[PDB]
Amino acid sequence: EAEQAVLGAVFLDPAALVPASEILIPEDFYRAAHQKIFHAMLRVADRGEPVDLVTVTAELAASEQLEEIGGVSYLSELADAVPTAANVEYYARIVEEKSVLRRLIRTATSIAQDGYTREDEIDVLLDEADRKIMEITGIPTGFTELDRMTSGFQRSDLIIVAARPSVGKTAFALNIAQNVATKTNENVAIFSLEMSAQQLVMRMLCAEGNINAQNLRTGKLTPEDWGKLTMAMGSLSNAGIYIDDTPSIRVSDIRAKCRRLKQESGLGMIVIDYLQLIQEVSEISRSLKALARELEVPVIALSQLRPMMSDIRESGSIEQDADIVAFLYEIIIAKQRNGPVGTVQLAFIKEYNKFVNL
Amino acid sequence: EAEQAVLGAVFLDPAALVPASEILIPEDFYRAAHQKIFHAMLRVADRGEPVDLVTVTAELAASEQLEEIGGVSYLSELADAVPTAANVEYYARIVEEKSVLRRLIRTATSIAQDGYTREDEIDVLLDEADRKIMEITGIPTGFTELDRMTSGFQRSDLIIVAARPSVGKTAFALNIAQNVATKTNENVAIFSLEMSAQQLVMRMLCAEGNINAQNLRTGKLTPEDWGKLTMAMGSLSNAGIYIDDTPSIRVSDIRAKCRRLKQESGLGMIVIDYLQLIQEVSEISRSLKALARELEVPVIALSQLRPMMSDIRESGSIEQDADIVAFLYEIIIAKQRNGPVGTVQLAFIKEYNKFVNL
Amino acid sequence: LLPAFQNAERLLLAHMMRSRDVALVVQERIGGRFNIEEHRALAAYIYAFYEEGHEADPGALISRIPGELQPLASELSLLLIADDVSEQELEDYIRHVLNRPKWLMLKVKEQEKTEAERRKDFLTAARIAKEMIEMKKM
Question: Where is the stretch described as N-terminal domain (NTD) (chains A, B)?
């Protein structure tokens, strides 16, 4: 039931062929009335030339094709369906999932007979019979520095971080989301699954107040850190970051949980627990890429690893639909779906949990 | 008609599932044609995507079974007519309600036949039929430095305190009950899983009496001990002392025969003996919360296997089950739904079985 | 069977069969403006019977209401009318009602797209559809 609908949208754009010319060719036709219709569509946009409803309909009246489809009644009903728009691609894939099959399946019928017909051959009957099958703009990352190359973290992206086991990326994925709720305004959703709500409170003050060379666990510090503290939790109320750990909530649930806040605050960022503890990945991780596109939220849906690209792109996606992918060892954004793909010079004190630049 | 109008108002929003997926499941639906529509939806909503109609008319054929729900004759209706957009609830709680009756009716002939084919169970038969439906302020502690940070030990909380191989475990439980029996007059039924009722007598003939070295494991008395028991076995029935002695009993023969002691005189704090005996735990450590709140009882359990808090999350539920976690490790009350993380320091009299205060 | 018009027009009458602010802002949206022939015949005793200064409820508002307009007047109220009237049930009914005689020109323009048709004119009528397509939105 793709074919009945598919053309309807292609019509009024005039650019619903950019991915569609990629997906469907003049072979991609289970049907008989449809095959020549699209060829009358394709002849148009080659100047091109311009693109509308009719530029095809009187083209069909010309070079031998109008009653072939049952008049314009169904030529109308090519349009009359698509009760949707926010999908995007999508859609023509249904036809391609009626397609791919037989380029890998119609190519196995001759063989089923190439034993009692081609009797009589054997080895060359393999060399060929197997061949066919295949066929600041731009909200900053907290910095004042990471603000001029790409800028943002703008309005919609998928981000997956992978550095050495549980380091400062553990801090950074969240140290992206610090100077947004308190020091400006925007309330940013930082949810968790590993490090609990009762595990992310004492150490933000380690990260804020000139207080961490002590430490803070004993209850009472030295005669200075209490004279210098009102930085860490005083404006936490008038800010907008709060912590959860619903053990390990699935790829649809948080996706359906970031709807309480999208109505309430507008939903600014979604710093998620590594998309690997959440419930081979070119599948499971493709339910947080598109939630960014509709929810209109930067979604930090992460990972847990050296760093290298097609190495986290190993057992799964990552080098594909997934957007910007940086590399902590210095922030090596050797991949950023952002334009200026580049490394920023940085450092770390490790004394007061505060990181450095140059 | 409760089924009929929850699966039509959807192709309108476009996405609206959050209450329909947590307040409902497909198993609620009746029609040998309406039931499987709903996950086909979840299946579709598992991407996904944003939501529409066409995703249905293809994925059920991708679930190969589109020859088993509709077609273009029946699939046109569901989105076409429905003039409502805030439905779901609704409705769906009635799809729950007209599916709740039989969370108590299908159970019947899987519970009510047993009176004429089984029995072949008896005590057992009267237990899982039960399973097949379910789905200072102040009261003191006894010790001065244990009534400290609690003051209860109240009629709605499960209380847990345990030691290691040879640290005197019930030797400590006695004194959370001894007071709350002989002196502080409240009736308590010691349903001792460990000790019997012809053995429990001595450890508090020895406590507030000091006659546990004579030895009082046997025999008679002296011109300084003839009447050390005139108020040690003279103070052993003028108390909440009606011991239960039996070994590894299930939760069954505990609740019913205790419940009734309410209206003749009263009931206070049920203090027992080691837990790994009551058998086995995921339901059992779950079957003492309602023992504390409905029957209104400050239940004080005990257990036996460095140890620490993981040693009861690696081994046992226990943590949220009994939420005022005390130790006989000195005492750890790191977890308690009565305070934070406090501490003391302790030692024994050792021979008379009297745990003393510092 | 029953299309949309037999399942939108009835219980909104049964929503307001009860109290006031429910019944109030209705005729101002439905003059009317009543779609079905006799779905106006009762609307002479729906508004003009609080006009007088009534108080509430379908006690007397189940059949008063005359005779042949009774075998629905009783069977109007019976069903799920959660009187916590949805603010998202709002723009619907009255847009569902009022743009039906707006949409009703589509059981018209399709039919002058298909009248000049067989009589031999088609691809300027393959422009009538571009007209037809757009008002299918509302």
Answer: 1-135
